[PDB]
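Budget justification note: compute hours in this period were largely spent on complex prediction jobs such as the one shown. Inputs:
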Amino acid sequence: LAGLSAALLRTDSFVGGRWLPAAATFPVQDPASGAALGMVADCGVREARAAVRAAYEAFCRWREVSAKERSSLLRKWYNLMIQNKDDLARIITAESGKPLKEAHGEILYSAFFLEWFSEEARRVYGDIIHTPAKDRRALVLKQPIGVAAVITPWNFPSAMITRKVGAALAAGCTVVVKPAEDTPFSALALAELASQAGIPSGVYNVIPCSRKNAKEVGEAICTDPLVSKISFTGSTTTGKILLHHAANSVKRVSMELGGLAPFIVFDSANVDQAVAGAMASKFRNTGQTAVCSNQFLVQRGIHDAFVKAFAEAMKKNLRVGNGFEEGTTQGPLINEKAVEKVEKQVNDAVSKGATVVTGGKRHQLGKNFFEPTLLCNVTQDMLCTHEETFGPLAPVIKFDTEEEAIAIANAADVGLAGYFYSQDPAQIWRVAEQLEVGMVGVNEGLISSVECPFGGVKQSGLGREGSKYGIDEYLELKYVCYGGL
Amino acid sequence: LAGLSAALLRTDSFVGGRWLPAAATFPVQDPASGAALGMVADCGVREARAAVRAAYEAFCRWREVSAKERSSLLRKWYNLMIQNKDDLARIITAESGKPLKEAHGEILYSAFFLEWFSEEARRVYGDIIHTPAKDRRALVLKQPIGVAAVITPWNFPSAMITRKVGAALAAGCTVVVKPAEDTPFSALALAELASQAGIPSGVYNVIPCSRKNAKEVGEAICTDPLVSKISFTGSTTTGKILLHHAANSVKRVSMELGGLAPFIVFDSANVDQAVAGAMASKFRNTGQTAVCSNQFLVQRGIHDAFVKAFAEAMKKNLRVGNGFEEGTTQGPLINEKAVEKVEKQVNDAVSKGATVVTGGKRHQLGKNFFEPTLLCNVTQDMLCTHEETFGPLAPVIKFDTEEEAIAIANAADVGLAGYFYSQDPAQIWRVAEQLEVGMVGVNEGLISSVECPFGGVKQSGLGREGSKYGIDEYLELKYVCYGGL
Amino acid sequence: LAGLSAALLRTDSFVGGRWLPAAATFPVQDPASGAALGMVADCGVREARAAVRAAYEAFCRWREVSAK
Amino acid sequence: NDAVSKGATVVTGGKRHQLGKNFFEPTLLCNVTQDMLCTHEETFGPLAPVIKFDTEEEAIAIANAADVGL
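Corresponding output:
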């Protein structure tokens, strides 16, 4: 709980290389125990504009720094994350409630994004194009957009910031981060390390704030004319609101919006593996992620064998409890509103035909704990207005044909992640290409990777993060027609 | 005027491979003579939704066609444009009023976009990425977005459509075009040729409409859930309105918004060349383009020599008249509102200190003709609310230093094209990199090219057209984590 | 005035067996001298609902405890 | 800016200082004219606008463009 590096646990906002408190503050509590973690600065529109100016002024200098130097600083920052991984992991578990093991996995992942873009910084290549005219040459330069507003969710309080910020800095941009109020510490812990690494003042800013100011501050930074880019990860409702704010000044935008995720098990699938995959993809972070398989489409032939083995795996591996407690596998839901959402989903389903296979009530520990649930006999029309209800709940929907499963999964206008298990080479390519999603897992339930492009299609988002395409979200192309030859 | 291929001059909308008239129509007149050119279908929201459905249904089939086949059709379409270039050029001159020579230049350019993307279609490459885990392989596929709404301006009634549509089709998308009401014919002439080339029904649709329905139809297609992409070129005001429409469903967007364009002449510049460049960049299409150098920043040292030689070039080469008339160099302004805008700009400037060097009144031919104007002694603060006033008018602003010229030109939040003349190797790189614009012309006043990326920074736009980056505006990345290995 | 058991003079709210501060606070002064006594947590509707839930969940267990 | 664009001639530094933040370069503009101080009567900064005059009666009349006087 404590014994942490005093420098890592922070309560003030970080702007212009300085720790600044705000007129107001907001409480942050351990989602599992309820223990007060601290009072965090509640930045208002005033503090946001100031942060933007800090970022803008830092940009005019930062963009001037050599890519080899920016690269060097991004790596020192990476090393500092690894050096402090144990304490950084505890901060995540303490505020998100996810099991320490998972938190340790996030910190590495988070650190790997800084490492990865550190390498990308020196690889922004322009082009030399041939044109008919002999009196000219065409060059294409790539330059950083400027200042970017980064708004992150609570699920992965560290990795979500690091994957956006790493790219931005590697490109030569500066950023103003607005972390989730449920988990502001991971963002400020990163700030402490950014100053230790030597990140110039104003290049990385963090302005924490609560529900009260969320709306105002969100609009302030997504509207400021000194801001030229917006990176948001969260709900579709907030996303669309920021898209309107952005529209007024034609800002560059990239976002990943919450949503469902199909998990299809075909007759030719290796049951145990499918189950292991369903286990990893559904109960990671207690089912609180946008890449969390919500609905399971399972083929008649293998249905029964699957639903049974899945349930038997849940009893064997899921241990609800406190994230710091050894052996815990399932942490608490972030808040009460969250629990109510799961209950809503479960009851609405049972009352409509669903058959609860195991645990469908609040856990005996009370508070925000919910029993990992598995319901079968679920039907497509039982997921309405629950597309953003995240919890340890797995509704299994049976199907007969492939064409059928694909049609159901593609009940789109939404499409982020998608999973499926099969042993048919031909079927694998068909489904993988036809699944209207941004990321597809084949015989795998965990697909995270800093070198691969994350994001969604249709209403699930804009742009991609990570991989060799991540840095492009923060660059502008400039065609230079060198003539007079 | 006539004697044109009856099949090329069309009046009905083109949807689902069929020519469909609308309940209403609107007149189109030769901007120079005033002659009635024809009654064109005025599509309403109903006809637009129908066109979208046509495009959507065509998409499910078109996306399935091999890239080599889509490529083949795009080229047949290109050949048909070249085969009919003379008549296609006349249609442009007849409706835009630009000189035949210029119209001939547009048709080639327009045709070259179809040719260019025809080649791009077979070159959409996915990736194979290495990841630490030995039990999996990472693949990245690129697939077409779906249906795109294409809204084009009147300036380049053909090339503006062709550069967007070529990319979309090459990527495997289908489109619904909403041409400018001042110049709908070029869009329909293309449709006739698309059917001759064998473009499948619904792949290329055109829904003409007038001011009345512009607002409604614009919203209809930029809102329809069957539409996943929007490509708009025009005013910043309409652009921002479409950005709001797009926001509601998180549509992919790419636009190029009108704006100023600096033309800097430095002391080391070759006067004659600078003048020739200023001539080409300012009076092309009679100064009616977004890439038209509006303000001229000229250094004290070479100022006088320049302003004089520029004026002497205007008298020698600019011949106002009818585009079909041999020897015409300057055509009419598109409409009265346009002329009033130029007058406004000229008078507002003179009355504020400017010195008219040559012709600053309506031309003696009357109607929409305006005398090519050149005013010196202009000052930065004389371009307010005129950033989108296009006409044959060149305001010259003197400057002392480079730092100064750059600061003035970068009075941004706007940035599309930029030009400058210099003979200093070092200065060339400095200005070219510091000019916050999307395209920079060095010792050249004409920079068009289908293999180079066009577009703007800040509020001048989103995305790029042409070149090897054009097709990316119409693709979605899909990361496939092939595991179970 | 002071020299009191630090544990007895408190400023945070008490919910679910834990001391929890609130986003806001309010001053408490000695009605006679005017001296500032301390800043006390100013609980809002959010903190109240949470306290109620704490009480409700505690009730299901407390009611079960023997009267002795 | 309102002054320069209206006729003023910046004699020295008329932009934010290179230190950024709230620093501004001490400015000195000449060729300024009385009608360039509107809605700026309470704009305080290191800025000195010089207005030329011929006679005493003139200078006094300008300075006494009162209803204000500290």
